[PDB]
Amino acid sequence: AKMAFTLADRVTEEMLADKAALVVEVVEENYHDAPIVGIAVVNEHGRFFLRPETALADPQFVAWLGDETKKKSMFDSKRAAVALKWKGIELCGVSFDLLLAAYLLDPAQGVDDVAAAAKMKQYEAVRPDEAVYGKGAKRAVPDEPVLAEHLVRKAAAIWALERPFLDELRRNEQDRLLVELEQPLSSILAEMEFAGVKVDTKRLEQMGEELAEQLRTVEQRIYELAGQEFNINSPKQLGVILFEKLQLPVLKKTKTGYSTSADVLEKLAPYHEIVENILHYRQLGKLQSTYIEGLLKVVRPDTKKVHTIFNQALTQTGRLSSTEPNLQNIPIRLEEGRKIRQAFVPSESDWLIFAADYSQIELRVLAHIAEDDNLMEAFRRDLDIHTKTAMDIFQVSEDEVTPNMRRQAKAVNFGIVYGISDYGLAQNLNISRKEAAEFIERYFESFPGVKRYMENIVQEAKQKGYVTTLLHRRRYLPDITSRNFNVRSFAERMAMNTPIQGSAADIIKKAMIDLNARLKEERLQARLLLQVHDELILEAPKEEMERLCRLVPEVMEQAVTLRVPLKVDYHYGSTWYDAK
DNA sequence: GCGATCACGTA
DNA sequence: GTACGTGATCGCA
Ligand SMILES: [Mg+2]
C-alpha cells in the first residue's frame, strides 16, 4: 500500500513543470533560520523526492522556485517561504495554499497538517505529521525512506485536493478571499516576520534590574505582612495565606479552590494591607517574567531582533495571532508596563517607528452592517462614541455626562461588540443582572437598528448554520441549536460578534495588501513590521515620515467603502513607545 | 517531561 | 461576554 516515487540524486527538467505540488519540509516549530529536511515535487510527469542539499544548490531548481510563472500548490507556504528566505532563496508562484483553503472552508476544524485537511475530503492516504515526527521530546526526523514517503504522500494529497477545495471555495463565494486576500497576505506576513523588529536588549536588561529590586522590596513586605514565607506565585499557597490564615472573605471560587484573581483582590483590599502588595507584586512580576525575561529569551543574538510567527489560520474570526514572541499583547494600558515598548526600536539609525490605528473600527463596522441611523450619524459627526452612547442611554446632554456614566457606556459598547449578555455586563461593571438588563434595554431603545441586527443575525445563524463577514469569511455555529442554555447562549453571542470582529479583520488585511502595493509604487524604503488587530506598525527613514503621514492613513481609510467613514489615527517616534 | 489549572497581557 | 499566547505551579510519571 506504498506510493511509487523517484528518490532523485539530481534535479531533472521533468521536475520543473509549470504546475506542481511542492513540499519544502521544515520540521521545527519555529521555522526562522531552521533546517529544510527534504523536498517533494508531484507534477504531470511523476513524483519526486529531493535531498535539500542537492536541490537548493541546483541553479535550475532555485530558478524554478523563484519563477512566478511556474505555479506551485503547497500547504503552509509561508513556513517554506520564510525558511527559504533565511537561505537567500525566493519562493514565488504559489497559486494555491491548502492550509489557507481549509481554514476558510471551516476555521473550527483546527487544520494544522495535510492529513487533517485531507480528511475533510475523505482522503486518508497520508499520515498526520505527529505520527511521523512524534510529539514533544520524542519529536525527531525519521530516516530517509520513512521521511521521503511521508513527504511524497503529502505532495500527492495536495495534488489531489486542490480541485475539490477550490470547488467548495467557489460554491461558498470564497475563491477571491483565498486568491486575492489570504494568499497575497501570506507573502506580506512572510516579509514582515523575516524583517523582524529590533530590540534594545540593554534597556530591557536595565528595566529588569529595576523590577528585580522593586520585586525584592514588595516580596519582603508581603512576607512580613503574612508573618511567614510562602510562594507568592502559587495561587494555592496564596489562597491559604489570604483565606485561611488571614481569614479574608471568600468572594469567588475557582473549580479547584479560591479565586485570587485581580478582580477579587481589588475587592479585598480594605481588609488587609497585604492585598495591595500582592496586586503590586502581581503587576511587577508579570512584567518581569513574561515581558522582560520572556522577550530577552526570544531575541536573536545574531540580529538583536525578534522574529514573530503570525498564525494566519488559527482564529475563528479571521484575526491574526502572533507567537514567539506574541507581539500583540505588549503592555500599553498602564504606564509602568507601557515603558516595555521603549525597547522596540527601528532597525537602522536615522529611522523611526510609524504606527497607525483604526479608531473604533468594530463599532463603525456594526454601524454599517446594522444600518442603525443613530449610530451611523454619530460616526458621520465623528463624535466620541462612548460619550454619545452615555448621552443616549442616560438621556442627558453632553455636559451632564459624568466620568462614570461614560465608563458604563464604554462597557456597554464593549459588550455590544462581543455579544451582549445580562451576566457579562453585570460582572464587568460590578452591578446586578437586573441592572445590566436595564442598561442593555436602554441601549437597544437608542439603537433600534443594532437590536434588529442582533435578532436577525441570530436567526440567520440558526437558519443557514453559519454567519459571514463583509469579505465572505464564514464561521459555523452548530451549538446555536443546543438545548443547553449556556452552550446555546455562547453560540448566539458568536453569531453577533463574528460578523463584526471578522469584518474588521477583513478590512485591515485588505489595508495591508493595499499598503504594501502603494509603498512599492512610491518606491519608499518604509517597511511593515507588525499588525496588532486594529493597528499597523512600520519603520522607515526619518525622511519618509511626512509622506507616510499622508499615505498610510489614506490607504487604510480607503481599504473598503462603508456607510460611515473609517478613521485612522497615527503617530511616529524613536521607539514604539514614542509612536504615541 | 506532560498536561490541567490559574492568572494576565492585548485587541 | 470576543479573540488569543505565555509563564508558573502542581501533581502525575
Ligand atoms: Mg484603536
A29-CA/C8-C1' distance, Å: 23
Protein residues with beta carbon less than 7 Å from any atom of strand C: A 231, 233-234, 236-237, 289-290, 293-294, 297, 311, 314-317, 319, 321-326, 329, 411-412, 414-415, 418-421, 423-425, 427-428, 490, 493-494, 497, 501
- List the grid coordinates of A427: 460582572
The residue with cell 497538517 is A113
Contact A345, A338 (CB under 8 A): no
In contact, A412 and A443? CB cutoff 8 Å? yes
Cα angle for residues A293, A295, A301 (degrees, 5° grid): 105
**8 Å CB contact between A575 and A344:** yes
Cβ neighbours of residue A220 under 8 Å, at least 6 residues apart?
none
Give the torsion sign (CA, A504, A500, A421, A385).
positive
The three three-digit cell numbers of residue A168, written as one number? 467548495
Whether the Cβ atoms of residue A103 and residue A75 lie closer than 8 Å to each other: no
Q: Buried b / exposed e across A325-342, counting CB within 10 Å, b at 16+?
A: bebbebbeeeeebebbbb
How many Cβ atoms sit within 10 Å of the Cβ of residue A371?
Answer: 13
Residue A504: partners with Cβ closer than 8 Å, 6 or more residues away: A358, A361, A362, A365, A533, A534
Cα A222 to Cα A208: distance, rounded to the nearest angstrom: 20
CB burial class (10 A; 0-12, 13-18, 19+) of residue A547? middle
DSSP A4: P
d(CA A430, CA A277) in angstroms, rounded, equals 23
* Grid cell 472552508 in the structure block, residue: A105
Q: HEC profile for A336-380?
A: HHHHHHHHEECCCCCEEEEEEEECCHHHHHHHHHHCCHHHHHHHH
Establish whether A358 is an annotated binding residue.
yes
Alpha-carbon distance of A134 to A27, in angstroms, equals: 11
**How many Å from the CA of A390 to C1' of C3?**
26
Distance of C1' in B6 from CA in A253, Å = 12
**Closest residue to C5 measured CA to C1′:** A326
Q: Which run of H or E residues covers position A530?
A: strand A527-531
What resolution (Å)?
A: 2.0
Between CA A344 and CA A197 the distance in angstroms is 7
Q: Which three cell numbers stand for residue A133?
A: 515526527
Q: How far apart are CA A35 and CA A33, in angstroms?
A: 7
The three grid cell numbers given for residue A254, joined into one nine-digit string: 475557582
CA A34 to C1' B2, whole Å: 25
3-state secondary structure of A550: helix
C1’ B9 / CA A238, Å: 21
Annotate A317-328 with three-state secondary structure: CCCCEEECCCCC
Residue A300 DSSP class? B
- Euclidean distance between CA atoms A154 and A132, whole angstroms: 12
Q: Which residues contact A231 (CB under 8 A, 6 or more apart)?
A: A237, A238
C-alpha cell at A109: 476544524
Residues forming beta bridges with residue A43, ordered by sequence position: A20, A46
CA of A323 to C1' of C4 (A): 10
Residue environment code for A379-399, b if the CB has 16+ CB neighbours within 10 A, otherwise e: beeeebbbbbbbbbbbeeeee
Please, are residues A258 and A239 in contact by the beta-carbon 8 Å criterion?
yes
Q: A403: how many CB neighbours lie within 10 A of its CB?
A: 8
| CA–centroid distance for A20 within its chain | 31
Length of chain A: 580
Q: Looking at strand C, which nucleotides approach a protein CB closer than 7 A? A: 1-11
Write down the H helix ranges in A172-200: 175-176, 183-195
The residue whose grid cell reads 495588501 is A513
Q: Helix/strand/coil (H, E, C) string of A242-271?
A: HHHHCCCCCCCECCCCECCCHHHHHHHHHH
Breaks (C–N over 2.5 Å) after residues, chain A: none
Nearest CA to A476 out of A494, A450, A453, A449 is that of A494
- The DSSP code sequence of A375-417 is HHHHHHTT--HHHHHHHHHHT--GGG--HHHHHHHHHHHHHHH
Task: Please report, to the nearest 10 degrees, the dihedral formed by the alpha carbons of residues A542, A543, A546, A550 taken in order.
Answer: -100
**Ion ligand 1, residues whose Cβ is below 5 A away:** A 357, 534
CB atoms within 10 A of CB A434: 9
The identity of residue A380, as a single letter, is R
A472, A177 contact by CB (below 8 A): yes
* Domains contained in chain A, CATH given: 1-194 (3.30.420.10), 195-309 (1.20.1060.10), 310-360+505-579 (3.30.70.370), 361-504 (no CATH)
Query: In this structure, what are the phi and psi dihedrals at residue A8, rounded to the nearest 5 degrees?
Result: -85, 135
Q: Answer for the pair A47, A156: CB distance below 8 angstroms, yes or no.
A: yes
Q: Which three cell numbers stand for residue A28?
A: 521545527
Is there a binding annotation on residue A45? no
Determine the Cα–Cα distance for residues A153 and A134; give it in Å rounded to an integer: 17
Query: Rounded distance, CA A554 to CA A511, Å?
Result: 10
Q: Which residues contact A293 (CB under 8 A, 6 or more apart)?
A: A208
Q: Name all contacts of A416-422 with Cβ < 8 Å and 24+ positions apart.
A: A416/A363, A416/A366, A416/A443, A416/A450, A417/A362, A417/A363, A417/A366, A417/A497, A417/A500, A417/A501, A418/A493, A418/A497, A419/A490, A419/A492, A419/A493, A419/A494, A419/A495, A419/A496, A419/A497, A420/A454, A420/A493, A420/A496, A421/A489, A421/A493
Beta-strand relationship, A309-311 and A305-306: unpaired
CA dist A461 and A457 (Å) reads 6
C-alpha A33, offset from chain centre: 22
Q: Are A154 and A162 in contact (CB under 8 A)?
A: no
Whether the Cβ atoms of residue A515 and residue A528 lie closer than 8 Å to each other: yes
Please name the residue that has the C-alpha cell 504531470.
Answer: A44
Residues 247-266 of A with CB under 7 A from strand B: 254-263, 265
- Are residues A357 and A538 in contact, defined by beta-carbon separation less than 8 angstroms? no
Cα radius of gyration rounded to whole Å, chain A = 27
Q: List all nucleotides in chain B with at least one atom under 7 A from a protein Cβ.
A: 1-3, 5-11
Strand partners, A538: A354, A528
Is A410 known as a binding-site position? yes
The secondary element (H helix, E strand) that includes residue A554 is: helix A545-557
Amino acid letter, residue A502: G
Beta-bridged to residue A23, according to DSSP, are A40
Alpha carbon of residue A356 to chain centroid: 17
Elucidated via: X-ray
Nearest to A567, CA basis, from A317, A320, A354, A362: A362
Handedness of CA A258, A260, A261, A265 (dihedral sign): positive
Name the one residue in this structure whose C-alpha cell is 493595499: A514
Q: Report the amino acid identity of residue A24.
A: V
Q: Which residues pair with A569 in a beta bridge?
A: A357
C-alpha cell at A357: 490605528
How far does CA A284 lie from the centroid of its chain?
Answer: 25
